[PDB]
Amino acid sequence: FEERVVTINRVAKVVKGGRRFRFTALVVVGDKNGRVGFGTGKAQEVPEAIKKAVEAAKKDLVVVPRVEGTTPHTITGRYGSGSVFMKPAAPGTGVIAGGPVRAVLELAGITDILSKSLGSNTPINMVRATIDGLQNLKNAEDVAKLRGKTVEELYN
RNA sequence: AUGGAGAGUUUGAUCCUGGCUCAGGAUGAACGCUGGCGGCGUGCCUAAUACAUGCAAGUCGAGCGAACGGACGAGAAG
C-alpha cells in the first residue's frame, strides 16, 4: 500500500508547567486499485505519529467502484461541514481535485475525475467527506441486482 | 461525459462561522528596466478644448454666349 502524509499538526495541551506539544498526522493509504483508507496518529515525534496513522489507515480500507479509472456516477460526499462534489470524467482529463481529495482519489486508483471542495477546507473533514462520497458510489451490476434487472435493462 | 484543484490568517490547542489576502485570465494601458528581426493587427480612452499652414468636392465645351490662342496658310519687299 502506498502512503501519503496529508497533514502534520502540532497540537498543544496546557498544564501547570506550560504547554505540552504533540504531533498529529493524517495519512491516506491505498493500493491504487480500488481500495483506499485514512488514519490519524498522534505522538511526541512526527515519525511515530505517521506510523500510527499508517496502521490506523490500513485497519479501515474502503472498496471504491471504478469504471475504467473514473467513478461510476457523480456524487457529493458530505461529512460535517466538509462537502466534496465528484463527477466522472473522460480519459486524459486527469485528477482535477485540490489538497486532501487528490491524495484519496489517486491512492484509490482513480486517474480521471472532476472535483470541487464546496465546504470546510479542514484536512480531516475534507478526507472524511471524500470517503463518504466514494462509499455511496454504486455500480451498475449491483443496482441491477438490487432492482432485479439486467444491466442492459437498467439503461433500457 | 471533454468540463469544475486550492492556500494563508481569529486559538494555548480545537471544530465551526466569518471577513480579509493570494495563486489564473484579460487590456486601445501607463510606468520601470531592457531591447535583434519579420508577418499581421492596434495606436487621444483625458479638453464635443482652442486651432497657425497645406490638402479633404468637383465635373461637364457632345447644354450656352463670349474671350484667348491663334496653326495650316493667306498679301507688300524693309
UniProtKB/Swiss-Prot annotation:
Part of the 30S ribosomal subunit. Contacts proteins S4 and S8. PANTHER family: MITOCHONDRIAL RIBOSOMAL PROTEIN S5. Belongs to the universal ribosomal protein uS5 family. With S4 and S12 plays an important role in translational accuracy. Pfam families: Ribosomal_S5, Ribosomal_S5_C. HAMAP family: Ribosomal_uS5_B. One of its GO terms (biological process) is translation. PROSITE patterns: RIBOSOMAL_S5, S5_DSRBD. The N-terminal domain interacts with the head of the 30S subunit; the C-terminal domain interacts with the body and contacts protein S4. The interaction surface between S4 and S5 is involved in control of translational fidelity. One of its GO terms (cellular component) is cytosolic small ribosomal subunit. Residues 1-64 form the S5 DRBM domain. This is Small ribosomal subunit protein uS5. Keywords: Ribonucleoprotein, Ribosomal protein, RNA-binding, rRNA-binding. GO terms for molecular function: rRNA binding; structural constituent of ribosome. The keyword Metal-binding does not apply.
